[PDB]
Amino acid sequence: KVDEAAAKAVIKNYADLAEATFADALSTAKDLQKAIDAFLAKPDAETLKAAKEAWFAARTPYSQSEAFRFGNAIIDDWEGQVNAWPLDEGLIDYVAKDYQHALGNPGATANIVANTEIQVGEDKIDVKEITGEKLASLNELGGSEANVATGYHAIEFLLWGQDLNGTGPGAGNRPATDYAQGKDCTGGHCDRRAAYLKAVTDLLVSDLEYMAGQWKAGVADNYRAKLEAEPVDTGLRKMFFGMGSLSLGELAGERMKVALEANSTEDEHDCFSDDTHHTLFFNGKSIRNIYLGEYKRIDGSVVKGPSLADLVAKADAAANDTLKADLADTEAKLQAIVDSAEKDGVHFDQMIAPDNKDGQQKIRDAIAALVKQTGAIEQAAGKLGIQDLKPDNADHEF
Template sequence: MRNIQTKIASYLLAAPLSILLFACGGGSGGSDGLGLALAALNMDTPPTATQSEFLNRYADMAYESYSQAVTDAQALYTAVDTFSAAVSPTAGDLTNLKNLWVKARASYLLTEGFRFSGGPIDETSVLSCGDAGDYSGSDECEGLLNAWPLDEDAIENYINNTGSINFAGIYGAIGNTSYGTEGNPEKIVMTGYHPIEFLLWGKDNSGSPAGVNSVAGVRTFSDFSGSGNGPKRKAYLKAITAALVGHLTLIRDQWNPSTGAYRTTFLDPANTGDSVGKIFQGLGSFIAGEWGGERLTGSFGGDQEEEHSCFSDTTKADFYYDAQSVLNIWTGNYSIVKGVNISTGAGLSNILSGKSQGGIHGELIKSRDVFCINLSDTETADPNYTTVCPANSLTDRYDQIILSSNPGDSLYNENTILQNTQYLIGETLKRDFVNAANTLGIHVTP
């Protein structure tokens, strides 16, 4: 006991020197030791970064994240271009496109933490996307990239009834219920990741009876061959994949360190408080309303149409990377593969005192790791694919888990884990995040 007291006293006596060394870029040992001593005395630890330092890191990470999304989308487009030029694409060619989509999807999902924060992804006063030569226009960019759910019959009917396929025509068909079968204009989604997903996998109605969904969609390469709709289907795929690259590029360029218009405004010292407030509000909205809200609760009724990536059966990856996207901003570390930091810097947590951070870090880790990316028929190209899942994680297909909501159902235990995870994100994490913002005088309305 005496030795412990002596160590704590020595840390407290050395505290001014430790803080000085930290501020001057000294080693982490003194700072960590001080934090341990203060924690032992139930005292708070101060923030380790200024708001300006955090905002610069946030802007850098936004540019890095969208740059990776562009790179992976471009790789997909290059393969689609080759695929489209082939007279008779093969099964291997189609599998290659699916794998590239899975990889591109992961890097895009890591940008989702930047939503709802007044930035170029979904604020039309900053940036609008469309069908112009550079893919600018008058629409919110996020909707053209990631809208869901979709009436997939609209895409097939458009292909069936259109002679020459081009992006301007596809763009003009958005919301036109004459192409669909559900009568809902919001489901006439013609562009973005999910229409590409549908074209690659087809409807996910496998199994007997239909709807058991023992595998992902089973579209075959022959759908892209012949002289009928095959060439038009390839043209549609190529057009919307090119647009995907174009829209992502516009967003990325707004964060460019040298020329990004939004970045300049965002980092203006006069806007520091406003920018920090928008980030807190955006993350709060994403955590409670989107990731832990509509996407999870919308699927609890067992409706496959509400499953985020229903054609490829990669919905668990959607939730995994949503958690990682928030964790990246929280820590300041840009990470795709679990445990591997591509770049590091000051995160949102660093502008908060130790106590103000609450349990957010652990809650983000837990809400990420519960989604195991392990499906051998569709997820092997995912950067975090694994054959060894953590204990108490979701190991089965998402569309089967949401159908097992009654005691006695085969996957009822996993359904319960999913329900508890929604509460963790939508209630516990939301509460702690709102409380953290309050300590800085920022009011968040999730």
């Protein structure tokens, strides 16, 4: 009875961490909505910069939610509308002549902003009136996962535009006049561009309001109620499985190894804003938050409770010590990536350049740390009787 109650308390705190993380994501998305509204009303350099800063701030809590993926299917079924990437951005707006898009993507040049009717394969689709529901129906349209119409990175593309700088300094620099209605309009169809940005921003808020509500305590019909009623070994496996699947397949593999080994700036997570270093860092923080049972909120307060770490320490102190040390080393390696961008001005798309020896090594050191901590996660889960964790490797060999 005592062991079961301890696991129950850890899973309850786990849901509290998710509740607070998604609540922070929702509130910062509402701040972003207000800055975007202010920008559309009075588009200029300063209101555009304010919208960009609000986007940056909205990313910090969302990136810390991603280790709740994989273990909790309700997030997996939902996040493709919220944070899908990479974009074949020619679906949305104009592109430069060196535009690179996926093979076999019939939507890659549809250009919704410019056209009241598009045709993606044989779906001839009315987009006269731009609504969130309509754009959502276009995600993965025609079969290609590069066809992304909504989410953080659709907003990102509409604020920054394409990053034309390759592996050199600088991000996208779309001009505010792309949203000037009437005569100073630049890039064409600025009324449809504003309508697009408004729709995806409102849709993001609406999606985050849904998900934040699914982790509220004391609600009989939501996911959190299901999770807390499940057998504790099911809940504990979900915690470890999210930790390991983000560490290995998604963070080390999809968000680092892919771009690094192809030297492909088009594959970095935050292509247009060059914020990829923060995504990686706060993804890493998501995993460590879950294991330690703590989440430091955007206002500085801390949500904290009984930890998965303490359960492991009772079963095997060495396994717990190894995993905590691996998590600390991983955070240091990801901090070095953040520091390269924030202190030295060398962003992720510059570090993966073929000639950047120190840039590539920092990324390879963080990959190695993430692979090591994945092994330590499996060992810790095994000490709690959770065998064959099999964290998802996203088909990468490490």
